Every structure is written in structure tokens, then in C-alpha cells.
Design a protein around this nucleic acid. Structure first.
Ligand SMILES: Nc1ncnc2c1ncn2[C@@H]1O[C@H](COP(=O)(O)OP(=O)(O)O)[C@@H](O)[C@H]1O
Ligand code: BEF
Lengths: 104, 95, 508, 98, 80, 95, 102, 90, 98
DNA sequence: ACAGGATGTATATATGTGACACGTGCCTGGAGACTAGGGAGTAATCCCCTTGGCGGTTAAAACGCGGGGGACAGCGCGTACGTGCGTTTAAGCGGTGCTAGAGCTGTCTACGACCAATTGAGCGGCCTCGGCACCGGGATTCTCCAGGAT
DNA sequence: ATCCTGGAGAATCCCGGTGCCGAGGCCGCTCAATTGGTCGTAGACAGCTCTAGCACCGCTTAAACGCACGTACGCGCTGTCCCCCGCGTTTTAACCGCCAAGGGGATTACTCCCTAGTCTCCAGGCACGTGTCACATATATACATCCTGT
């Protein structure tokens, strides 16, 4: 009898509803707005976690570390555009060297 | 006695186990994921509020959230998020 | 006859080499009386009647007695050349200069021919609309104007037009609005003409609106009587019997299956998938082959056989052309868009038929040269392409014997002035008007709108129309012995020049 | 002895510091600088250790980005060594006025 | 006083190596110190304003996160 | 029948005549000034709302607006604006 | 008496109060917040208009034009920093050419 | 009587930004000498910027269920991308 | 005749276009380009004249800023003539990815 | 060009250990049901505003040519940067002790939303005249020149 | 090889008349600002606390600092030659002028169904204690990589 189970979404619908009501972004909240929000957030989290898991499996690490998150974010172009200005703590930078700097 | 902060750690872990059963996540990565999700939620809520105030509409429906997603998320991310949100809204309003 | 001649001599002394007709003498006398009483009038006549002749006689008379003041002629570009030709032919010892060309050319012509002060040899300037509009504030404001004329005064339709402002900046004592069809599309646009010709008689638009079923007849008779002393009018059929009358035949053609599937692709929005909406359906009505070619991107013209047998009334068009070629008579073709003219010119050059086209891209010298070679007897040219906006105003193509309108403008007065370009003074053979219009399309709506607009100008069977015209009906329509034949026919309808329209309910 | 060229050691150092992903600035001098800059604005201000760590992380990321843009500027000028004019040009293009 | 000199030459060298700089000039260190001082001044001013708004005497990590977000650089992991 | 948009044109003209009696202002400059004032007002209101939501305070007082001014306006502009606002608030609460 | 005259401000206090209440940036609005907002907006407008009038008097023009506004905004470092990303329509850029170019 | 082919296919709308226009823009910017490919790269960058702004404005219009792109939508789209326009803004 | 050097005419043109403060791009080609780019996203979209004017103003301002940064890049490289690499470097430093 | 040695780096294995994940009490937030009202969905009008094209003209755009000033390739240098080593000094980790300050809980208390009437401020419209735009012209300045002195 | 001075020409600035359109002053009014009362809830404030920030002393060893160098790189001058720029010509497209049509923005009457607000309840989620397994560290070890002489 839960909205998250009815909508087939893992993220909580009631918590997002209460957050939107507390933030007072609108005087009246729509019925389908929290479900849409939960779906979008779940898809984004799933994409990021899948990319981070692929990066961690490529590095032969069982647990995802912030380094894997930053690598997956910088390697991905759409997530890189969505998350350009953000900096990840203990993530470093994407390893890349210019061709002019490398001796040929 | 103490405030119980509300985080998406359990849901992030569930989504990870759904997409990657064997791969785990540490505490720092969990906190980073929670911060990223909270930032995206705050950004989309602010964009939906701005859209509602621009059109002089006190209510925020799925249309406002879809427009905010199309505005914030770029390209394929926005398209897939809109598809997923429409599917979820249809499954919610049908059942 | 002799009294008209002697009156023309005693009124207009310099007018020699030509004789004014009885109606022309009455019109020029009316203009002299208007000048005497100081009331500016709107001289109006049918397109076939000679409007330039009465005005040129009036100007020659004004040059004769009293003083000789600066005279300004504002008219379209394609008619100022004919105006200068007629002022050189019908009025010797009278100077006139064409004020048109580049900035430096116009400036040097001004500084050479006309001085800063008044002069006895001051030539009557004949300029265009755009030239005068651009040079009023710069040059024309310095020189006074005792008498100005504006040929084709339908350009003065809009009351907020910039030409009105540029003319108001100019100072002129008397005016003369020359318009073949003084009344136009909706209502009260003539008030702008009335306000320009008579500022005090019609000061505001609300007054004319207040002027405006028995009371409808009462007010239309009242406005007809009010417009009587200022506006003169004569028709081609009532004053003179020397010119053969005209016959208007709306030749309906069924929309071909290619155009049928085009139209269904338009109404379900699947044309672009196969390979506003009003302009698209109109382009589908006339030569949609060029529409699909320009949306495809091909640089080469489609096959000429495919062009003629694929879409449009082009088949009925070719039937009419071969019938007229067997008839041995020149033809005039008017089109609304230059693309239709380009397609027709391409087809005619593919077939080898001699054609001359007059559009806005054609310069004044080429326009005059083409008019001259088409008005010539040795020239084997029979097909002459014209545009309804430029080539359909003020030109005298009398050598032609019939006109055919592939398209019809939303304003019926434009199509009227275009079809009456051939039927002028000196037309010996009877003229025929074949108005092409695809059947069961929106061109029928355009014609209905034009006729509802013609209703107010006059106040001052559908299944038989649906079919395609047969060869026997074409032959029944080809004969010219009736002008010197039912009113309705299969695929063709005869327009009543008096009254009537497609929708008689709106016409009444 | 074995004396390497100035290029291979620089490349090894670049690779090591790109793969390390740790804090390159010492914590105590950075904390001293942060406390001095804070006292410059308002006196008697205490600092949380996590706040100082976040400040250090943000400063390191910003300096790494600035060095990225400065190296781009230097390579554009056909010079391997970065110069103060490169940093000035990067700051001017990024819109970070002095 | 000399706390700006606390950021030593090896530290700036390591930062440039992580950036990808191969050769560093001697005058780069002072310019980098000045730029870092300007950036820290801006961020610390914003954080101190945020702290004074809440009538607190201790700068919180959330205040620094908000100050960095105001400048366009969002930091993840240290928030909260 | 028609919406009467609310602009600060009269107040901008009054301030201009106060600071410069002889100098006038055109319509384009007036519209640009109105747009600038509206943008500053919207920015400061959003910053005050964010500050109120950060401190879990439903009410926005002069303190929130002063903090938003100190955050948005740089340096001497912020100082002079804070001084003017404090003087105005004191004159309002005293009379 | 009006709130603007009561607070000694030329900008409308009631209109700003209505705007802040309609925007719903907060549930409740203090009494001094609209007065403070009006004072800040009035000071900013006065500064910008003074700079624009100075720029107009420099060009011997009595009317303030968008060009004068843009020149006054870009010349001042404070207003230039506040309106850095602002692009004023119908206004060019600062007249300046690099010394290497000359 | 020249041989005719459908003629004067319009030069691309990206080519509508002509070389003298880009030259005048560079002069206003303060450029003295301009290379050859500078015009083409300027056309490309302008196309990218217009694509972004027009996408944002079209999204704003679709949110309002309107078929016409008004000036306020363009102003909001520009404000989203950082560049604020005060003149045409309402 | 009088043939000026390529420098003085360029300086006069720069001064004239910095003092003119008008629209340098023609309205009709820019409107055609805007309509084409809009139809590329969604078809049957009408445009307001003021919206097209605002788009043109914003595009002109952005291109002027890009030319500012490109001239800065070129002067940094000790070259008077701007080159595509200068525009690419300016776009990369400004953070405007392709 | 190829063989070989010193250096750094990739790789398999043993044993911590401290951080990740799982079982549990419970409590505050999520969920079910009824209700009244204001925000939202919707049919019909219309009249301001957008679209498409013609006529033309004229200033802007475009093709072609000469040369000269700038981008670029190559070389000598000498100076500033990098690398390795003895040394030292300040970062970091451990351990304790103190207290200013963050946070929650109870109690009012002065301050802000709501609603009824209203009456003066600002937005809507038509002069209306003066600051501003375009123009012919004499005067001044900038610059291109082939000369003139040494 | 400069190095000052000379004159014609294109460009630029100051001054005079003007008219014209956009800025500026007036007025009936109407919808929003203001005043009087009330309330219950957000907020200011006194007090216990505990926990996290600040200061110091001792060992240490990794990191920072100064110096000798020699070698690779930033930098100035030179020859060029090819690409951008200045100008007569033309041609071609911007635009302002004009016109009918009609898709589309805004409003108002209505209603109705979606949602705010409240009492009750109980299950999902968070705080705390905990054992183990993934990952960090040390050591041996085979192997890839760099600098020099034959
Ligand atoms: N009195 C006349 N004698 C001979 N021809 C005449 C006469 N009057 C008019 N025309 C002919 O009429 C034409 C000039 O008048 P027209 O062009 O019809 O005036 P508009 O075009 O303004 O109606 C010429 O062809 C001319 O030969
Ligand atoms: F007056 Be025009 F010749 F018809």
C-alpha cells in the first residue's frame, strides 16, 4: 500500500512529497509530480552507479570509491556536461597528457 | 532526542544491487551519491518553482517537472529521464 | 464631330496631332470646371477608356492659358515610359522629363533640365512611387507644385501608408487621383483617397463610417449622389460601341490524381514523409511540381512532358494554347507569382514558342522594348507573360486578342485591371477572358471572396462546374462571332459583367 | 652514475601525481593561511576540521584547474614552460578578475 | 604574515604536475600564491557572512559548501 | 480590461531628478533601469529565501535582506547599501 | 501617510511588500524587510543614475541613452563586477585597443 | 534566352552571416588581421550558441503551450546560460 | 593615388565600430538562420520580431566577447592575426565545449 | 644500432584491522478516509500580430588584382630550470586537560496574516514643444608621398 | 642611411537651420495601499550540558631548503613568400513599402475535480553493538624502461 511499490520505483515517493512540501517550491503540489521526481532521480542514480561499477570492475576493485565515481563522471560525456562544475573530494583528475608534451 | 537525517543511502544501495549485484559501495561514495542526488533534487525543484512562477500557476504538476528535467539534464539524459518519468506516471495513474 | 474638334482646338491650343473623343472632351471640360471652381476631383474611368488622354489635354490647356506651373506625375514605373511616349506623340512643343534612376542620375537630370526657380520651359516631371517617396523630403520639398496627378491611385488605399506621409510633407495646390477602379476591397479605404483629394470634405474616418434593407438602398443611393460631383465614371460598353466587347469564361479543371494525392498529403501532413497551410494548398493548386522540386532540392527542371502532364490545369492550358495557335491570335498570360511565370517560360522555351516576360526583375528599358516588340506587326510573338502587380498596371498591349489568368488575386480589382490590359482603344478583334481555376479546391473560395468584394463595387450548377471541359465545349467557347453559347456550361462559367457572383447570397 | 633527463622524471612525477589522488598541500600551513584570512575579515572565529579539509580540497581542485588552463596557454604559445603571463591570460579569459 | 609562504615550492610543483605542467618557471610560485589568496579570500568572506547570518562563532562545513556553490564550484563528499 | 504592469519608472525619474535635476532619461534607458532593478530585487529575494530555508526560519526579517545584500553586492556597494538600509529601518521603526 | 514618506524613501514600500508577498519567498515577512529592500534598491538606482548622468554630461548629451548606461556600468569596478555577465541591448563595448595593436 | 535550371538555390542560412559581418564584429571586438578559417569557425560557434539558446527557448515555449517564441522566453533562456539581456527584457 | 597602410584603416574601422554601437549583422539572414535552427528542433514555430532582435543582440554580444578573447590569445602568442587555434583555445578555457 | 647495468615498477603471498553490513527496539513520519473550496480544464470571440510575396533601389555584398607586412622555418646562445645529495626543520601522530561554544528544552510575548472599508497614487490617453538627427560647408587634423637637405 | 621638414589629398571636427518625432506635463479613475482589531504561533531569552575546538610538550622522520652543474629551452635576428588587406567594379540581396488571410495570444462565465488540512495508526527507517573480509603495508622478485659506449 506504498506509493513507491505502486509506481515500481525504489526511491521513496512520500519522502520526496514531504521534501517538496517543506521547500515550498509551490503552493499546491501535483499528484504525479513526486512520482516523476522519484523516477528521474532513480534513473540518474542508476546510470551513475552503473558507470561507477563498470569503472570499479575495470580496476579490479569490489567496492566503489570516489575515484571510480570521478572517473565514470569524467569519461561519460552527458554526465560530464551535467556535472562539469562539480569537484569530487578524493577523486583526483582524469589521467591525460598532451601529445606535444610527450616526446615523439 | 537526536535529529534523524533523511538520506537515500538504502535506496542507492538497492539501485546498485539491482544494476550490479556483486559490486559494493563504500561510505564516502555513498555520501557523494547522496549529495549528488540532493543537489539534483534541489536544482529541479527550484527550476519547477521558477517555471510555475513564470506561468502564474500555483500548482506544480508532472509537466513542470518534465520541463525542468528537459532544461537541466542535457540531451540523451533528459530524453531517457522524461521517458522513465512518463512510464512511472502512467503506471501510477493506471493502477 | 466637328463641334467636338473645334471645342478641343479652342480649349486646348497646344493639343495637336490627336483628336479628343466626345467623352474625352466632356471629361477634360469637367476637369477644367473643377480647376475653375478649385475643387479637386478623382477622375475615374474603365481601363479601356483613355485616362491619360483627358489628363494630358487638361495639362496642355493649363499650359496654354494663364501661367505655366510645375506639374508632377506620380505613377507606377511601367507606365511612366508610356506617359512620356504619349506626351511626345499627342502633345508637341511640351517638355517632360523622366525622374527615375540612380541617385547621381536623378540629381544630374534635375540640375540640368529643371532650374531652382520657375521657368517657361519647365518640363512636366514624371516619376515613380518609390522615387518620389524617397526624394520628397530631400529635393521635391524645395520646388512648389501647382498641379499634381497620381495615376493608379489604388496605391493610396491604406490611410497609414508611408506614401501619404511623404506626399503630405510635400506642398501641392491641386490633386487628381487617376484610378480605373476607385472602390476597393472592404470599405472606407476610398475615404483615404477622399481625405487626400478633399481634406475638409472627409476629415475623419468615423464620419465616412457614419455615412455608410430599405435604408441600405437609401444610404447607397445617398453615397452615390455624394460621390457624383467629385468622381466621374464611364464604362467601356455604354459610351462607345467601336470596341468589341469582352467575354469572361472561368475555365474549371478537375484536380488531377497526382494533385489529389498531394492534397491528401497536405491535409494529413505527410508530404515531407512521402519524399501556413493556405499558401501550401495554393502552391498545390498551381504547379505543385515546382513545390516538390524546391522541397526536394534538385537544381534541374523536371521533364517538360512530366511538367505538363503531371499536375495542374496544364493539360487544359495546352489545349487552350493549341486551339489559339490554330486561331492565330496573340495571347496575354497573367500570373500572381514569378515562379509560375518561370515554369511557363521554361516550358515555352522547351517547345520553342516565342515568349516575352515582364516582371519586377525586368528593368524599365527592357519593359519598354518588350512592349514595343509585342505591339509590333512583323513580330511573330503571340505568347506574352506578365505579372499582375507590375505588368498588369497601366500598359497598353492592344496587339493581343485574348488574355488568360492562371491565378486570381484576392482583390478582384487587380484581376480586372489585369484582364482589361488587352481590351483598350484600338482593339479590332473581340477579346476573350479565360480565367483558369482548378475545380473543387480553395481557388473556388478565393473566387467567392473576390466576387463578394465585387458585390460592393457593383452597388457602388456546382456539379456542372465540377466536370472537366471537353473538346466540343472548348470549340463552343473558342468562337468570337458572339461578341461582335449558354451562360453556364460543363466545366466553364460565364461571368456577368453587370452583377452576380459565385455566392449570390453574399452578392445581394 | 645514472642522471635522467629532465623529461622522463617530469613525466613519471606527472603520472604518479595523477594516479595518487590525495592531498598535495600540507594541512598545517593551509590551516594557518585560512585562519589568517578569516581573522582579516572578522576576529575570534573558530574553524571545524571538516570545513578546513573541504576548503583545502576546493583550493586544490581550483589550482589544478588553473594549472590545466595555464598549461593549455603555454602549449598554445609553443612554450613548454609556463609563465606568469599564461596565468594572467587564463584568469582573464575565465572571467576571474583580480 | 608568512602563512602565504606556507604554500611551499614543492607543493605548487606537485599541484602543477597533477595538472600536467612539465616545466615550471620561478615566477609562477608567487602568482599562484596570489591567486590562491584571492580565491580563499572570496570563499572565506562568503563563509564568514553565512556564519554571521546564523549568529554563530564557528565556521561550519555546510557554510563553506554554500559559499563554494555561490561561486559556481560545487563540492561533493564534504557536505554534511 | 488590460493588465497594468507595475514598473519603477516614476520612482527612477524621481531619483534621477533628485541626483541630477537637469539631466533627463530616455525610454530605452528607463526600461533598462527598470529591468536592472527588477533583476536585483529578484536576486536578493531568492538569496533571502535561500538563507531563510538554510536556517529553518519561515520568516524573513531585515537581517536576511542585509545578509543577502552583503552576499550579492561587492565591497563598498554592499557597505553603503547596508548603511542606507539600517538608516531607513531605524527611521521607520522610530517614527 | 504612505510608508515611503514615513521611511524617507522615494521607492514604494507597499509595492515591494506586495511583490515579496506574492513571490512567496517566505511564509511571513518582517516589517523592516520591505523598507530595507526599498532603501537598497533606491541607493543602487541612485548610484547607477549618477554615473549615467556623469557619462551623459561627458558626451554633452542631456538625455541618458543605453550607451551612457553601459559606459557608466563598465567604467566603475563595483557596478562592473555586479553586472559582469549583463549585456545591455543597443550598447557597444568600451572603447579600448591594445598597445601591441598600435 | 539563357538555358534555365531551377536557379539561385539559397545559400545556406549559416552562410547568411557574411564575411564583412564577421569582419565588423571582429573590429568591434578589437581584431586587426583576420585569418581565412576564422569566418567558418565563427559561423560554427554562432550556430552552436544559437542551437543552445533556441533549444532552451523552445522548451520554455512548449511549457507554456504557445506556438510563438516571445521575447521573455528568449530572455529567460539567455539568463539560464549566464548572459543577461536588460534591454529587450520585460 | 592615396593608398593607406593596412594598419591605419584597420584602426579607423575599429574606432568607428566601437563608437557606433549598433547591429552589425543583417537582420534577414540572421532571422533565416534562427528559423532554420528552430525548425531543426520543432516544426511550425512562429517567432516574435522582438525575440529575434534580442537573439541577434545576444549573439552579437557573445561573438564580440569571443573576438575579445581570441585577440587576447593571439596577442599572447605574439601574433597580430587571429587563427582558428586561438578561437579553440578561448572556447576551451571559457568552458564552452563543442 | 645493439648489448648490458642501475633504477623504478608490476606481481604473488602472509597477517593485521578498522570500516562495511546485518539483527534489533522503537518512534516519528508515512498512509487511509471524509470534506469544503479555490485552482484548474474548457467552449466561444476577437482583434492584434505573424506569415509570404511582389517592385525596386541602393548601399552593402562580391570577384579580381598588386604588393607589402606579418606568420613561420632555421640557427646561436647563455641563462634559467631541473636533477641528485647532505642537512635541517617543521608537518604529523600519540596523549592529556580545559572550557567556549553548539544544541534542546520550557515559557511566555510582541509581531505578522486576514478580513471589512476606503480614498488617494499610478497607470491609460492626446497634446505638445524642445532635445536630437540629417545636411551643406569652411576649417582643422592625420597620413601618404616623393622629394629635399646632410 | 637617416633625418628632418614640405605639400596635396582624404578624413575628421565645429558651426548654422530645421522639423520631427519621442520625451514631458494634465486628468478621471480604479484597484491597490492604509488604518483599526484579533490571534495563535514564530521568535527572543534564561539555563544545563557535553563535546568538540584550541593550546602544549616529546620523538620522529619525511619533507623542505641550499648549492654545483650542464643542458635543454626561451628568445633576438635574419630571408622569405604567401596570405591578408586597400581599392575600382558590379550585382545581388536587405529593406522599406503594401496587402489580404488567418493562426494564434487573452478574457471572461463556469464548474468540477484535484488538492490542502485534520484525527488516527503502524510499519519503514534510523540509532547502537558487533564480527568479519576487502584493502593497506612490508618483502622478495622477475621484468619493463632509460642513459651511455662500442
Ligand atoms: N483620340 C484618340 N485617338 C486615337 N487613339 C486614342 C485616342 N484616345 C486614346 N487613344 C488610345 O488609348 C490609349 C491611351 O489611353 P489609355 O492608355 O487607354 O489610358 P489608361 O491606360 O490610363 O486607361 C492609346 O492606345 C491611344 O491610341
Ligand atoms: F493609366 Be493607366 F495607363 F491605365
Amino acid at each position: 500500500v506504498s506509493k513507491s511499490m505502486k509506481a515500481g520505483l525504489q526511491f521513496p515517493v512520500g519522502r520526496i512529497t514531504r521534501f517538496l512540501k517543506k521547500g515550498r517550491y509551490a503552493q499546491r503540489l501535483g499528484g504525479g509530480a513526486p512520482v516523476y521526481m522519484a523516477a528521474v532521480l532513480e534513473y540518474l542514480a542508476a546510470e551513475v552507479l552503473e558507470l561507477a561499477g563498470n569503472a570499479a570492475r575495470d580496476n579490479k576493485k569490489s567496492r566503489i570509491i570516489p575515484r571510480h565515481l570521478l572517473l565514470a563522471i569524467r569519461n561519460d560525456e552527458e554526465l560530464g556536461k551535467l556535472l562539469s562544475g562539480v569537484t569530487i573530494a578524493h577523486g583526483g583528475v582524469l589521467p591525460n597528457i598532451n601529445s606535444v608534451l610527450l616526446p615523439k | 532526542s537526536k535529529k534523524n537525517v533523511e538520506t537515500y543511502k538504502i535506496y542507492i544501495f538497492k539501485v546498485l544491487k539491482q544494476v550490479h549485484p556483486d559490486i559494493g559501495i563504500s561510505s564516502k561514495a555513498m555520501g557523494i551519491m547522496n549529495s549528488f542526488i540532493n543537489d539534483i533534487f534541489e536544482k529541479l525543484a527550484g527550476e519547477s518553482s521558477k517555471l510555475a512562477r513564470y506561468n502564474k500557476k500555483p500548482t506544480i504538476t508532472s509537466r513542470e517537472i518534465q520541463t525542468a528535467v528537459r532544461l537541466v539534464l542535457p540531451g540523451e539524459l533528459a530524453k531517457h529521464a522524461v521517458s522513465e518519468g512518463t512510464k512511472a506516471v502512467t503506471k501510477f495513474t493506471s493502477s | 464631330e466637328e463641334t467636338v474638334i473645334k471645342l478641343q482646338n479652342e480649349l486646348c491650343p497646344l493639343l495637336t496631332g490627336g483628336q479628343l473623343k466626345s467623352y474625352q472632351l466632356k471629361g477634360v471640360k469637367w476637369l477644367i470646371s473643377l480647376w475653375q471652381n478649385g475643387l479637386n476631383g478623382i477622375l475615374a474611368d474603365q481601363m479601356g477608356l483613355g485616362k491619360t488622354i483627358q489628363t494630358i489635354g487638361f495639362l496642355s490647356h493649363l499650359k496654354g492659358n494663364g501661367l505655366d506651373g510645375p506639374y508632377l506625375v506620380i505613377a507606377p514605373l511601367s507606365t511612366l515610359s508610356n506617359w512620356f511616349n504619349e506626351i511626345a506623340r499627342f502633345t508637341p512643343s511640351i517638355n517632360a522629363i523622366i525622374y527615375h534612376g540612380d541617385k547621381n542620375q536623378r540629381d544630374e537630370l534635375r540640375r540640368k533640365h529643371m532650374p531652382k526657380t520657375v521657368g517657361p520651359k519647365f518640363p512636366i516631371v514624371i516619376t515613380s512611387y518609390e522615387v518620389a517617396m524617397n526624394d520628397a523630403k530631400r529635393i521635391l520639398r524645395h520646388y512648389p507644385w501647382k498641379y499634381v496627378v497620381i495615376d493608379e491611385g489604388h496605391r493610396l488605399k491604406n490611410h497609414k501608408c508611408k506614401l501619404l506621409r511623404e506626399l503630405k510633407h510635400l506642398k501641392m495646390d491641386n490633386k487628381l487621383l487617376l484610378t480605373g477602379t476607385p472602390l476597393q476591397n472592404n470599405l472606407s479605404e476610398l475615404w483615404s483617397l477622399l481625405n487626400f483629394i478633399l481634406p475638409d470634405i472627409f476629415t475623419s474616418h468615423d464620419e465616412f463610417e457614419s455615412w455608410f434593407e430599405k435604408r441600405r438602398a437609401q444610404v447607397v443611393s445617398k453615397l452615390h449622389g455624394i460621390l457624383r460631383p467629385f468622381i466621374l465614371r464611364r464604362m467601356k460598353c455604354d459610351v462607345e460601341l467601336s470596341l468589341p466587347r469582352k467575354k469572361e469564361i472561368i475555365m474549371y479543371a478537375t484536380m488531377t490524381d497526382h494533385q489529389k494525392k498531394f492534397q491528401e498529403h497536405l491535409v494529413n501532413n505527410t508530404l515531407e514523409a512521402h519524399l501556413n497551410l493556405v499558401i501550401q494548398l495554393r502552391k498545390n493548386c498551381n504547379h505543385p511540381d515546382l513545390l516538390q522540386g524546391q522541397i526536394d532540392g534538385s537544381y534541374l527542371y523536371p521533364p517538360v512532358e512530366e511538367i505538363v502532364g503531371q499536375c495542374g490545369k496544364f493539360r487544359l492550358l495546352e489545349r487552350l494554347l493549341v486551339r489559339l495557335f490554330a486561331n492565330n491570335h496573340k495571347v496575354l498570360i497573367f500570373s500572381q507569382w514569378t515562379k509560375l511565370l518561370d515554369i511557363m517560360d521554361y516550358y515555352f522555351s522547351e517547345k520553342g514558342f516565342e515568349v516575352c516576360r515582364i516582371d519586377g526583375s525586368v528593368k524599365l528599358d527592357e519593359r519598354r522594348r518588350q512592349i514595343k516588340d509585342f505591339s509590333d506587326e512583323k513580330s511573330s510573338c503571340s505568347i506574352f507573360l506578365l505579372s499582375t502587380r507590375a505588368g498588369g498596371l497601366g500598359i497598353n498591349l492592344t496587339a493581343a486578342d485574348t488574355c488568360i489568368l492562371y491565378d486570381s488575386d484576392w482583390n478582384p480589382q487587380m484581376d480586372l485591371q489585369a484582364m482589361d490590359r488587352c481590351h483598350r482603344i484600338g482593339q479590332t478583334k473581340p477579346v476573350h477572358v479565360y480565367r483558369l481555376s482548378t475545380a473543387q479546391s480553395i481557388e473556388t473560395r478565393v473566387l467567392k471572396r473576390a466576387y463578394s468584394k465585387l458585390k460592393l463595387e457593383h452597388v457602388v450548377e456546382d456539379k456542372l462546374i465540377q466536370t472537366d471541359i471537353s473538346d466540343a465545349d472548348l470549340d463552343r467557347l473558342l468562337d468570337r462571332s458572339d461578341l461582335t453559347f449558354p451562360v453556364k456550361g460543363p466545366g466553364w462559367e460565364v461571368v456577368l459583367p453587370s452583377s452576380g457572383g459565385m455566392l449570390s447570397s453574399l452578392n445581394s | 652514475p645514472h642522471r635522467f633527463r629532465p623529461g622522463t622524471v617530469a613525466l613519471r612525477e606527472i603520472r604518479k601525481y595523477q594516479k595518487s589522488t590525495e592531498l598535495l598541500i600540507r594541512k598545517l600551513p593551509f590551516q594557518r593561511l585560512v585562519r589568517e584570512i578569516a581573522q582579516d575579515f572578522k576576529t575570534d572565529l573558530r574553524f571545524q576540521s571538516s570545513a578546513v579539509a573541504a576548503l583545502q580540497e576546493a583550493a586544490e581542485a581550483y589550482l589544478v584547474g588553473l594549472f590545466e588552463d595555464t598549461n593549455l596557454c603555454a602549449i598554445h604559445a609553443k612554450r613548454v614552460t609556463i609563465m606568469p603571463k599564461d596565468i594572467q591570460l587564463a584568469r582573464r579569459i575565465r572571467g576571474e578578475r583580480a | 604574515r608568512d602563512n602565504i609562504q606556507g604554500i611551499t615550492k614543492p607543493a605548487i610543483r606537485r599541484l602543477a604536475r597533477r595538472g600536467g605542467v612539465k616545466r615550471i618557471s620561478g615566477l609562477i610560485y608567487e602568482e599562484t600564491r596570489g591567486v590562491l589568496k584571492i580565491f580563499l579570500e572570496n570563499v572565506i568572506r562568503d563563509a564568514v557572512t553565512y556564519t554571521e547570518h546564523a549568529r554563530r562563532k564557528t565556521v561550519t562545513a555546510m557554510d563553506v559548501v554554500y559559499a563554494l556553490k555561490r561561486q559556481g564550484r560545487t563540492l561533493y563528499g564534504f557536505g554534511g
